[PDB]
Design a protein around this nucleic acid. Structure first.
Ligand SMILES: [Mg+2]
Ligand SMILES: [Mg+2]
Ligand SMILES: [Mg+2]
Ligand SMILES: [Mg+2]
Ligand SMILES: [Mg+2]
Ligand SMILES: [Mg+2]
Ligand SMILES: [Mg+2]
Ligand SMILES: [Mg+2]
Ligand SMILES: [Mg+2]
Ligand SMILES: [Mg+2]
Ligand SMILES: [Mg+2]
Ligand SMILES: [Mg+2]
Ligand SMILES: [Mg+2]
Ligand SMILES: [Mg+2]
Ligand SMILES: [Mg+2]
Lengths: 56, 171, 88, 125, 138
RNA sequence: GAGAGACGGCUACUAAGUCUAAGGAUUGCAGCAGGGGCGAAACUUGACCUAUGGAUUUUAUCUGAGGCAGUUAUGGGAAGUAAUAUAUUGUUUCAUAUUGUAAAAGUAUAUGAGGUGAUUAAUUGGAGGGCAAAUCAAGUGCCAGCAGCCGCGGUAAUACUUG
RNA sequence: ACCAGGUUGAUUCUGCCUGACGUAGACGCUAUUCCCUAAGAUUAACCCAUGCAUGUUUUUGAUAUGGAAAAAUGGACUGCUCA
């Protein structure tokens, strides 16, 4: 008297929205370059990391 | 593994510290390095002579002050991290190993051919040097080098020029 | 191993022969002679490495069969002849 | 664009093999490494022996330096050059496959006689 | 037993006390060759027989989906846990599976009782990729 | 036979066989390739005496010892996927000479064209604490599921599913 | 030459579990170069189709201008595996 009929109920039920294409992300030392100049303008080194990076 | 296939450097002990990633990222953006891995290679040999500098201060052998310690001071002086000292005098040999403990990682990281171009007037930025070396436009006195992490010795410092027959010049 | 050995290895070669421990695998096991195992060297290494008269195996036979080589006042044409200490 | 210069380093004389040895130095300033046809012509002016008696080999370019190294062997006449050199080093200046030589040798050690006997037993049948 | 010439009495005494180490005791008796469930290897193969579910312990409440298989190397029967949502719909009977362990030194972790193995491959198709939707099941 | 209790030498028994005109005859891949079984688990039924060696003088005889190439995320190195301010210049994916090779590759030196970094040119794992990073949005409501340990899920979930 | 989370309404200890880090094998997803280095050991020292790995030498000279046999010399080294 154990039910197995409800296998996979939630994932097939939620509707699918499509992906949105993005620009080609830079890779290499230029990827480390875009991350370093972006941190230096907001003073991330001076306040010793006490801020929120992912802001949305 | 075998001698040709062992690894040189491991991961750090603590993977996530906010007090370590901030200090190291100041070094990557300043000197222009692409990987966190290639930073780890230049610091281990910085650790290895400091492992040897402590032993020569505590040696009780009468000849170890003459031979291996004088064979320590030269190898840095040829690459030119140390400036120069008189090896005949005994008391300055004691000063040479005492000056060794006051170095940093930047004393090794500054004598690289990528940074040594930009500190001269040839390059505008340090990222101007990495894009210039790999195309083959920069030459030492006879040789055309394509490795930006090539260590530059002391005597070969002033003889860095452009390649005379490249398109970076007129020809 | 029911008998004698006839193949020698380059890693256990004597260092006084000044050989390279590079690409080769085997080395020449010289003949029995008057000298001991330590004070002897093969002849084919002398005409190649120390003296410089030949380049490959073919030019070794040319000088040896032309009968100019004179060890202790005797002509010899075998490349495995051991040159010992003190001989002229 | 073709450039070649010759500099002679370590000239030595060999009496038993009847030859001379030297190490060459090539300056190719704005050019590739030279072909061996033109360099054999250049030694015929300095060394007055015929161009056929001269052999050169092992032209290696040092990387990114525009300068290559090679070796020179010269003889007087033509016949001793065919005698003292190797075969393929001569044939570059101017056999049977392996898998067939193994088959005929194994059939040869089978027989106890000539081909006269090998047919003679087939005559009886 | 502290003395200068007492090395024979020191080694004999310290070997006795070392036998009460619970990790070292299993190394002497060799229980990993005697009482191993799966053998001595990272994975195994099997043939599915049932598709049944179990109920987890208190205070949580759910139904955990498992499968009873039979191994090839030894021939025993064992149960394994299907590790992702909606993945049992691929599985049919009279089929082959590959089994991987949990990583807690031979014990059961989570609130799943008495089960120490989980399925990784079905018909040489990766179940982690098939949940993502990269491949299709034949 | 100088040296074998030898197995690419011989004799017998035991376990497995194969050919036949039925009287008899015959085989040992823990040698190199290759197939079968076993398993979670491991490559070309390829060319050659160039270099190092052995066979009683080894410059032309033999050498699956030993070199030279093909298949594979077994690991370690030198490097790429941009730089200066839309634009300028110019690294790889293309070809060709010479050097080289036992004969063929490949590397190095030089030379050709075409014009693109949303491109031929970046992925894997994670976002409550340990432990760097969202109380962002939409669905489901102790179900479906996640979690090495502590622990979330009862119609406002930063702890499941998608974006 | 370095420690963190977990027993209680809250505190201090003993004690264990877990996280962080190495070395050999297998596996999932994704891959542009070049040089170096490796590949049926773990279970089965289990069975093998086919092709190939040990012959040289005027010492004499086959009714035979250069090869039949006989003599001589080495096949006991080298290579493979770990019962
Ligand atoms: Mg673990
Ligand atoms: Mg044997
Ligand atoms: Mg034996
Ligand atoms: Mg026997
Ligand atoms: Mg055999
Ligand atoms: Mg085999
Ligand atoms: Mg493998
Ligand atoms: Mg992602
Ligand atoms: Mg935090
Ligand atoms: Mg986990
Ligand atoms: Mg989490
Ligand atoms: Mg085996
Ligand atoms: Mg005979
Ligand atoms: Mg074993
Ligand atoms: Mg055993």
């Amino acid at each position: 008297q154990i039910n197995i009929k409800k296998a996979g109920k939630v994932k097939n039920q939620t509707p699918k929205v499509a992906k949105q294409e993005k620009q080609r992300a830079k890779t290499g030392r230029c990827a480390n370059r875009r991350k370093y100049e972006a941190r230096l303008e907001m003073g991330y080194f001076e306040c010793n990391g006490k801020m929120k990076l992912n802001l949305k | 593994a075998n001698q040709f296939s062992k690894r040189l450097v491991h991961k750090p002990r603590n993977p996530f510290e906010k007090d370590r990633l901030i200090k190291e990222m100041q070094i990557v953006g300043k000197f222009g390095l692409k990987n966190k891995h290639e930073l780890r290679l230049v610091e281990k040999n910085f650790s290895n002579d400091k492992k040897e500098a402590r032993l020569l201060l505590t040696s009780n052998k009468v000849e170890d002050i003459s031979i291996n310690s004088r064979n320590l001071l030269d190898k840095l002086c040829t690459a030119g991290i140390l400036n120069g000292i008189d090896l005949t005098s005994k008391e300055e040999i004691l000063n040479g190993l005492n000056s060794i403990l006051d170095l940093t990682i930047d004393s090794y990281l500054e004598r690289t051919l990528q940074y040594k171009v930009y500190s001269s007037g040839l390059a505008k930025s340090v990222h101007h040097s990495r894009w210039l070396i790999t195309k083959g436009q920069i030459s030492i006195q006879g040789v055309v080098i394509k490795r930006p992490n090539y260590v530059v010795k002391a005597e070969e410092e002033a003889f860095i020029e452009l390649t005379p027959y490249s398109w970076s010049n007129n020809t | 191993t029911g008998g004698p050995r006839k193949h020698l290895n380059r890693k256990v070669a004597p260092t006084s022969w000044k050989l390279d421990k590079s690409i080769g695998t085997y080395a020449i096991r010289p003949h029995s002679g008057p000298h001991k195992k330590d004070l002897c060297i093969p002849l084919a290494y002398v005409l190649e490495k120390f003296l410089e008269y030949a380049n490959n195996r073919k030019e070794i036979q040319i000088i040896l069969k032309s009968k100019n080589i004179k060890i202790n006042g005797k002509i010899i044409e075998k490349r495995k002849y051991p040159v010992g200490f003190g001989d002229v | 664009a073709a450039n070649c210069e010759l500099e002679i380093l370590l000239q030595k004389s060999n009496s038993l093999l009847s030859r001379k040895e030297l190490s060459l130095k090539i300056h190719h300033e704005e050019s590739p490494v030279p072909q061996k046809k033109v360099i054999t012509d250049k030694l015929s002016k300095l060394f007055q022996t015929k161009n056929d008696n001269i052999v050169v080999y092992d032209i290696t370019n040092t990387p990114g330096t525009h300068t290559s190294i090679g070796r020179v062997n010269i003889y007087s006449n033509q016949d001793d050059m065919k005698r003292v050199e190797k075969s393929y080093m001569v044939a570059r200046k101017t056999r049977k496959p392996r898998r067939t030589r193994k088959d005929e040798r194994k059939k040869a050690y089978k027989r106890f006689g000539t081909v006269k006997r090998a047919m003679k037993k087939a005559e009886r049948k | 037993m502290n003395g200068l010439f007492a090395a024979n009495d020191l080694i004999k005494s310290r070997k006795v006390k070392r036998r009460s180490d619970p990790y070292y005791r299993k190394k002497i008796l060799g229980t990993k060759y005697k009482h191993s469930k799966i053998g001595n290897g990272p994975q195994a193969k099997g043939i599915v027989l049932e598709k049944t579910g179990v109920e987890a312990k208190q205070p949580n409440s759910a139904v955990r989906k498992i499968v009873k298989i039979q191994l090839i190397k030894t021939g025993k029967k064992i149960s394994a846990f299907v590790p992702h949502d909606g993945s049992l719909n691929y599985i049919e009977l009279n089929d082959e599976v590959v089994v991987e362990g949990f990583g807690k030194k031979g014990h059961s972790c989570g609130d799943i009782p008495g089960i120490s193995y989980k399925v990784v491959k079905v018909q040489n198709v990766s179940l982690l990729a098939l949940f993502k939707g990269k491949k299709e099941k034949p």
